[PDB]
């Protein structure tokens with residue numbers, strides 16, 4: 001019942017959550033718990049938090065009307081990481097690796 005393009009998006013999402021990518025995907029599995037991590041400035045700096053569990057809920061609830069809306073949330077999640085963290089931080093290295101997985105497979109969108 002997902003559109004053909006949203007089926008491809010759901011496939012990508014499943015891959016980002018799969019064991020294959022867990023070594024660098026794990027920081028993006030759930031909403032950043034700023035208080036738990038001691039990041040008491042996180043919500044002053046990041047106005048629109050996003051994470052893969054939220055993307056999954058939105059896909060299941062048919063919130064995304066097209067691939068573009070799905071991709072905007074996945075890229076918002078990476079952008080938040082690049083905005084908050086210094087560019088040489090291990091969490092940013094993990095973001096760059098998972099975004100490479102995302103962008104190369106998003107590029108294979110059926111049309």
Ligand SMILES: COc1cc2c(cc1OC)CC(=O)N(C)C=C2
Pocket residue numbers: 027028032037080081084085089091
């Ligand atoms: C433990 O290292 C961190 C984990 C996380 C964050 C920062 C960290 O170290 C500075 C915040 C973040 O951007 N994301 C995606 C999730 C977890």
